[model samples]
Target: DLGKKLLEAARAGQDDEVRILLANGADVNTADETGFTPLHLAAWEGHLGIVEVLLKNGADVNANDERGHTPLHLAAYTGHLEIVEVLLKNGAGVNATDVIGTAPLHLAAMWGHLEIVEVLLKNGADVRAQDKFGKTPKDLARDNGNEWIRELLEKAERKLKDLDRKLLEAARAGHRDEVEDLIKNGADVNTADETGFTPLHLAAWEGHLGIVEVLLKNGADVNANDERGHTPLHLAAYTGHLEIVEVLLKNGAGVNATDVIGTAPLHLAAMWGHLEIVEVLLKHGADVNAQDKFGKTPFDLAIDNGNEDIAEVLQKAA
Candidate 1:
C-alpha cells in the first residue's frame, strides 16, 4: 500500500509524504505495470527532493520505464540540469540509448538542451553514435541550425579529421615514408582534399607509381573523381604516366569518364602528344571518336596539336 502511495506522492513532488512512506517500509524501487519506478516519476516531474529521498533509500537511479528510458533520459529531455547532475552523480548512464538507439546525447541536442549537452559531453558521451535513423547527434544538432551546438560539433569533427588533413599534406609533398606510416596508422586512403581530390588523385598526378600501387593495394578507389569530375586515371593519362595508367585501368578505372568541359582522358593525352599513353588508352577501349563540349574528339585534339603518330592511331578508331 505504501509503495503505491509513494509513487503518487513522488509523482506529485510531495517530499514529506515520500519520506514518510519510505520510513514506513515502502519499497524505494516500486514500479507500476510499465516498469516506471518511483525514481522515474520523481526525476520526470523534476521532484528533486523526493528524488534524493528515493536515492538515499536505495532507489535504482538507472531504472528504465517501458520505453527503456532511464531517469537520465527524461531529465536530459526536459532540460533539467540539476536532476541530470544528481542522476549522473548517482551513477546514471551518461550515454544510455533507448530501444531505438536514441542516446541521451541525441535527445539533448535535438531539443537544443545546451547545458545537458555539455554535461553529457563532459561525461564522455559519444558524439558520433548513430540512432536507428542513421543520424548522429551532430546531424540532429544541424537539423535545426543550432548555432552553439553545431559550431561545437564542427570543431569536434575537425579534430577527428586531423589525421585526414595530415595525410593530404603528405600526399601533396610525395613523402612516401610519411604516407606509409599514416596509412599503417589508419588514415583514410580515399580522404579527399578541400578541392575534392583524393590522395590517390594527387599521387597519380605526380606520377608516383610506387605511391599509386600502395594506394591501390590499400583499397584506394581507382575511379575516385575530383571537383571537375576528373578521376585519378584522368590525371595519370594526362601526365603521361604509362605505368600508372596500366595499374589504374587494370584496377577498374573507367575508360570513358568526362570532366567539367566534357573532356575525357584520351583528349588530354592526345592533345599533350603522349603517343604511348594514347596507344595505351586506345588499347584499353578509350572512346576515340567521343566529342567534348566543343564537339572536339581525341582525333580533333591530336590533329590540332600536329601529333602525327597519335592522329594516325586515332584515325583508325574514328
Candidate 2:
C-alpha cells in the first residue's frame, strides 16, 4: 500500500505527500510494481524540485530501477539538464555508465544535447569512454555525421594523441622545422600508429615532397607497411601522388609490396585509375604480372575497378 501510494505521489509530483510518506516511516527506496521508486518517476518527469526533495529525504540518487538505470542516468538520457545538475550536485556519480556502457556525457552527445554534454564534461565525465561496441562518443558522433559533435571529438582525440598526432600534423602543415626536429630527436620514421600510417606514409600520401625527402634521407624504410600492409608506395599510388611515388622509387622503395588483401602498389594505382603511377611503376621495372594473395594480377584489379587506362598500361607493360 505504501509502494502504491508512493508511486501515485511521485507520478503526480506531490512534493508534500512524498515528504510525508518518507517522514511516516515509509521506505525511501520503495518501488512500485515496475520497480521504479518515487525518485525514478520524479527524475523521468524532469521534476527538479521533487528530485531535490527526494534526495533530501534520503532517496538514493544512484539507485538502479528495472532497466539498471540510476535516476541520474534516466535524467541524463531524457535530457533533463537541470535535474541532471541537481543530481550531480547532490553527489550522484557522474561517471556512472548504464547497461550499454554509455556514460552521462555519451548519452548526452548521442542525443545531440550540447548543453548536457557541456555539463557532463564540466563534471569530469570521461569523453573517451568506450561502449560495448568499442566506440567512443566521438566515434558515435562521427559515424552519425554530426559535424559539430565531430569537431568536439576531434579536439579530444588531438589531446589524447598529442605527441603522435604532432608528427602527422607537421607533415600536413608542411612544418619542415618541426618535422626535421622530430626526425633528428629520434621519432621513428617508419613507426605505424594505430591507423597503420607512418610519418612517411602521411607525407607521401599528402604529397609533401620536402618532408618526404627528409624522411627518406633519415633511412625511413621505403617499403614499410601500414596496418593495412600498404607501403608508402601504395598510398602514393592510390592518392595519385606521382612526385612522391617517383621520389620513393628513386630512393629504392618497393613497387610490388602487397597489402593485407594482397593488393600491390600497381593494383592500387590501377584501381584508383592513376595512369601516371601505373606508367611510373612500369618504367621503374615493377612486375606487371605480380598477383595479390587472391592470385589476381594488377591488370585483373584494373579491369575490376573499371580503370581502362590502367588496364591498357598494364597490358603494355606485359
Candidate 3:
C-alpha cells in the first residue's frame, strides 16, 4: 500500500513526495497489481528528477509489470528523452522487448519520438531487431507514416546509393515527391529489381498511380517484364486496377503479352474473377484462348473458379 502510494506520487510528478517515500523506506521497486513499478510510473509521466532519485535509491531500472514493459519502454513510448537517458545510463536495456517483443526502440520509432529515436540509435539500439510479428522498427515507422524516422533508421543505407535503388525505395515508400526527385536526379525510369521487375511494375502492383505515371513519363517500357516474364500490365490486370489497366492499354501495352508460363494479362484478370478487368482486357483485344504452362486458358481458370461473369465474357470472345 505504501509502495502503491509512492508510485502514485511518482506518477503525479510529486518529486518532493517521491523523495519522502524513498526516505521513509518505501521500496522503490514496489509495484501495483499490474506490476508497474514506481520507476515505470515516473518514466511514463516524464518525471526526470523523480526517476533519477528512484534509481539512486535502488529502484530496478529495468523492472517490468505484467505487460513486460520496463521503465525504458514507458520512457521511450511517452517521449521522455531525459528520463530515457537517465534510465539507459542507469543500466536499462534499450533493446529490452515487451511481452510482444516490442523494444523501446520500436516504441520510440512507432510514436514518432525523433529525439528518443536518436538517443536509442546513439545508445546502440539495433534497427534490424524484429518484434514478435517480425516487423523491424523501420517497418513500424513506415506503417505509421513517420517517414523521417524511417529515413533516419535507413540513413546508413540511404547514403550514396545508385539512383536506381533509391528510386525503388522511394517508390516502395510511396514517396511521390521523392520519386520525382530521383527521376530528375538521373534515376533510370526502367531500372529493374533483382527479379527484373521495374519500378513501374512495383508502383503498379502497389497501386501507386502517381509513381506509375512518373515512370511512364520518364520512358518506362509499358510492357516491361520481370524475369518471370510478368509485365506491369499483368500485375495491374491481376490486381483489378481498372485505371492502371486503362493506362497501360492506352500506352501500347501488348494485350497478349504472356509470362514464361504463358500466363497472360487476361489469364491473371480472369483467374482473379475481376469481371470488369476481364471485360476491359477483352475490349483491349486480349487473347481469350491463350493457354498457360498447365495448358489451361483464362477461360478454363475462370470457369473452374465458378466466375460465370468472366467466363461468359471469354465465351463471347471465343
Candidate 4:
C-alpha cells in the first residue's frame, strides 16, 4: 500500500521519498495496523523534514496512537526538541494525558530531555500534575537520576506557584495591568487557588469586566468551577454583575450549570431580582423547570424572594 510505503519512508527518514509519495497522493494521515500515523512515525524517528511535510498536508498534530501517545509525547521522549517545537506551534496538546494519565512533561523528565522539558513548561504544561501512581514529573526525574531535570522542574513549580498567587491576587483586586504582566511573565492562566477558584472566577466574582476580558483572551477556562462547583457564571449572577454575566455567557459558559447545592445561575438571578440576567439566561436555554436540592425551581425562588418580574419571566419561559 502507498500508505505503508509512506510510513516506511517517514520512519526511514527518507525525505525525498516522503515528498514523492505525498505528491503522488499518499495520505499524510495514514496509520499502520498499530494505529501509528505517518506523523507519529516521523516524529518518533526524528524526521524533521518529514514532520513538516506531513503537517503542511493537514496531519493531525494531536493524533493518538494505540498506546494513547501523541506525536508530541513521542517527540519529547525521543529528545527531538525541534519536532516538539513544531508540534506545539501547530497546536499540540501540551498537557494531554495518555491512558495512564502520563503527560508529555512526565516523559520528557524521565528521559532526561531537559530542553524538551523547558519548552513544554513554557507552553503551559502542568508542572503539578500527577500520573495514576501519584508521581509528578519531578519525581520521575529524581527516580531516573536526572538531577538537573529534577531541579529545573522544581524551580518551575515554585515559580509557577508564585505567579499563580500573584495572578490570583491581581484578578481578585481588579488590577488589569498586574494580571496582564503576570500572564506575560508565564503565569498559568488556568492556575487555581487553594479553593479551586481560578483567576477568571475571582475576576468575574469581583465584577471586573476588564480583567475578565483579559483573562479570557489569555485562555482562561470560561466554565471552570470552584470548590463548591460554582462556575464564574454562578458568581457573576449572584453578584448581580449583568455585564459580567453577559460576557461569560458569550464565551460559552454553561447556562444551566448547578453548584453543589444544585442551584443554577437562573435561580440566583431570579432570587436576586436580576431581570436582565434572567432574560439572558433564558436566551441561552437555561432550564426553567430545573430544581435545586430543595426542589425549588427558579420560579419558586423568584416568588419566595418577592421578585415578581423574575417569577413572571420564569413562568412564561416554562
Question: Which residue pairs clash within candidate 2?
Answer: 196-227
Pairs in steric clash, model 4: none
Rank by lDDT, descending?
A: 4, 1, 3, 2
Q: Tens-digit lDDT track for model 4 on 6-118?
A: 99999999999999999999988889987899999999989998899999998999998887889999998899999999999999999999889899999999999989999
Q: How close is every model to the real structure, measured as TM-score?
A: 0.56, 0.50, 0.50, 0.65
Model 4 TM-score relative to the real fold: 0.65
TM-score: the better of candidates 2 and 4: 4
Worst 10 residues of 3 by lDDT: 155-164
Mind giving the per-residue lDDT tens digits that candidate 1 earns over 1-318?
Answer: 887998899999988888888888999998899988999898888988877889999999888888889999988888888999999999999888889999898888888988888889888787768899998889998897777987786776675478678878787678888888888765778899878899899988988888888889999999997888999988988889999999999999998999999999999999998999898888889998789999999999999889999999888877
Distance from true location, Cα of 285 in model 2, Å: 53
Ten residues in sequence with the least summed lDDT for candidate 4: 309-318
- lDDT tens digits, residue span 169-254, model 2: 78767888998887654455656678778888888888889999998898788887777788889889989988999999999998
Off by over 4 Å in 2: 163-318
Off-target runs (Cα >4 Å) in candidate 3 are 157-318
What's the number of clashes in each of the models? 0, 1, 0, 0
Which residue ranges in model 4 land beyond 4 Å of their true spot?
Answer: 1-108, 111-137
lDDT of each: 0.87, 0.81, 0.87, 0.93
